[PDB]
């Protein structure tokens, strides 16, 4: 139910956060880094999968925002339809007037 | 109408997405901007950072605001019913038309 | 559909159905019909068809409420309306034309056999409750 | 920019939505015979008076 | 503009020419013949919800073995008589025929039993029948000489009942067009008994 | 004589209007107000009883219920006049004190009803319980008085308790009863069922021997308490605690 909802939202931030983070970095160092120390960790063996790579990164970042920002909208407009639908939630006068129709009716029948 | 706390909920929830749009647009900003930072051209680096900063502002203060509608959802709960009275004011109706016909001055 | 149901019993006392839509009602010097038309001068009694369909919506109206009080009274009580009993829509206008009708022949008749022969005879008129 | 174009025109429509629906009213989701999908519909029958 | 399932009837009749030895015509008239009982029974089946006879005036019942319908009317009549109806197949001209099985109709003289064209006439056959069994008992009535014939309405019998020691008057009798029950003008407790003696 | 089959449950009152509002949501019928008083009767122990089969047990003492509906021009004090007279009463009936007092009551001494202990077996899913009902409709004599009339059968009086609440009538000839129970003793008024409101769904059978009919209404009782799911837990009381034979002294309150 709305913790599952609740549950849910956070992986969704916190994956938006690291994808986010994820293409930052991608980006910012996608000029290959080349650094004789053997501590740096930058490998770039096959030259064209390189951007084979590159582009896999872009795809899945795409998606990833995409699908996240859709279904977070579903998601409000979810909760709104929930709102709307499931919060549940003189005598005598008359006596003379229809005397008066009735006299009416039988004078005009 | 709806009673007013519904509509200020839905005021609410309608503020919720358009910050979502503004985030998804200045994401395209940011996006657009690195582009010329990568190309070589340090007029715009001081936008940058502002851009950054509502970015992440507004991903932030959105997400709060959702969890705190959320969080209203958890309270709220404990917080034909018309037709029981339907007939009722559909007989109060007919007999108003009555006198409308019974007074020929008011037939104007 | 009421007013269909309810008439149908009323054929030996001269009211008779047309059609699916159309009701007929007979008086020694009237006529009444009652018909559902789909869309596709001011007489005399104009304002007598109009006071005869909101009396009409009335009844139908107190037959409903009494329903409902029936429902409400006790859960056992099977609500199957009884067409000689719970319906009664045309029965009361009818009865009241047709008693007016016999009030004025037993005035005539009362007048010509009484008043006309005995002078002096005093007629006081009421109503019992 | 096309999710820009397409997510206003939802929010067009969406208020469209809000700012055209009143109200007490016996309202639901249907599943259309045809359609198959959910609907919005409204009880307006005497049935419970 | 029925949707013909075309290609099932190509195979079928493929099928029976290969077989054939006239079975195609055969097998295409009884199946003319059951499609028209089965309109005919679902008009039934629509006008009995909201038409005049609903209330156990008429009573279907429909065998797509035999292809025929029973129709049985005026359950609530006695006078030696029992309203029966057989719509069935005619062996001479293969063609779907109505029949009124009444004895009372067998000996009635320039008057017709079978009728044709159902589809587009039910409803006035219906009608047909209805008066002119009304009309048989009428004239079984004026037969009898009990009731004495009016002039002026051919439908309304006039009995002679004294209403005083010498008033000598005449009360109209009329037979209901629909179940068949005989009832008065302005019928009196007594008269109202009796009558319902009479049905 | 009746077989009743019911489900029983209890609810705290802070919870109550809420209730009252779900309720009228399902059964689409607004509550009735009502009220009772119940007198509880058991066999004179002055008598001895040696009738009692002890060698066979071909039956065994019982008690009896008188009950009578009372007016609430007796149960509304003066400072409730000026509301209409409706369910929303029943928020202000939360204290020990009610305005009927111990001489009231006296000074009014109905339907008689006498019960027996619910089918055993477990494979029953609703109380089943047998009661035997007849109405008492006037009386005369030097001595015509309720309490006289029960001496003269050989019986006394016990105790009594005046109960207070609502009713919902639906479908199928289900009756669903909100309850406050007061016990009264000359010593003062005692609300057993404090901070609460007791909650009882039941239906009657008149035959016993039908058991299509009693399939139908084992059928609608668990239904209506699936519908409740989540809300309110209806359950099955103890048989043990619904025995009203002399022998053995308890009451479901």
Known sequence: ??????????????????????????????ADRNDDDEGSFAQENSELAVATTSVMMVNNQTMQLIKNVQDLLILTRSIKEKWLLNQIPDEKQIEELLDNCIETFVAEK | ?????????????????????????????????????????????????????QFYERLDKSTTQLRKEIQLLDENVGTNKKALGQDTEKMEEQLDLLSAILDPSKSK | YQIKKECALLISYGVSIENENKVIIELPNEKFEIELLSLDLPKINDKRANLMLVMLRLLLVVIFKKTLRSRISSPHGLINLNVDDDILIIRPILGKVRFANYKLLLKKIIKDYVLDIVPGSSITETEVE | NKLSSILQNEHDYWNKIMQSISNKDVIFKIRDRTSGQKLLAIKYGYEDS | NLPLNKPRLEKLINEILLKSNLSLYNFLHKYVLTLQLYMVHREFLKLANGGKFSKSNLIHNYDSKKSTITVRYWLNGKMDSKGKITIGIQRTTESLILKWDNQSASRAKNMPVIYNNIVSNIEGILDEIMFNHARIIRSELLARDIFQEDEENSDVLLFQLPTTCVSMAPIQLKIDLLSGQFYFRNPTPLLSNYASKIN | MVQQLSLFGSIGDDGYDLLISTLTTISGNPPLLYNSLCTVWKPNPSYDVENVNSRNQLVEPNRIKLSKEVPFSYLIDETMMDKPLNFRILKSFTNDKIPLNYAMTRNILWSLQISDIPAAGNNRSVSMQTIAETIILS????????????????????????????????????????????????????????????????INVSRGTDIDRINYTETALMNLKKELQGYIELSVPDRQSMDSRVAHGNILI
């Open chain 1, 1 to 30: 139910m709305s913790n599952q909802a609740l549950y849910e939202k956070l992986e969704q931030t916190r994956t938006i956060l690291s994808v986010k983070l994820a293409e930052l970095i991608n980006m910012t160092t996608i």
């Open chain 6, 139 to 202: 009386s005369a004599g030097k001595n015509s008085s309720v309490s006289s009339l029960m001496n003269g059968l050989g019986y006394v009086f016990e105790f009594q308790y005046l109960t207070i609440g609502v009713k919902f009538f639906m479908k199928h000839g289900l009756i669903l009863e909100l309850q406050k129970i007061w016990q009264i003793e000359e010593a003062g008024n005692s609300q057993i069922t404090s901070g609460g409101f007791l909650l009882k769904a039941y």
């Open chain 2, 1 to 53: 109408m709806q009673p007013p706390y519904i509509q200020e909920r839905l005021k609410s929830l309608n503020d919720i997405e358009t910050q979502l749009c503004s985030m998804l647009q200045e994401a395209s900003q940011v996006t657009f901007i690195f582009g010329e930072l990568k190309r070589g051209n340090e007029s715009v680096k001081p936008q940058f950072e502002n851009h950054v900063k």
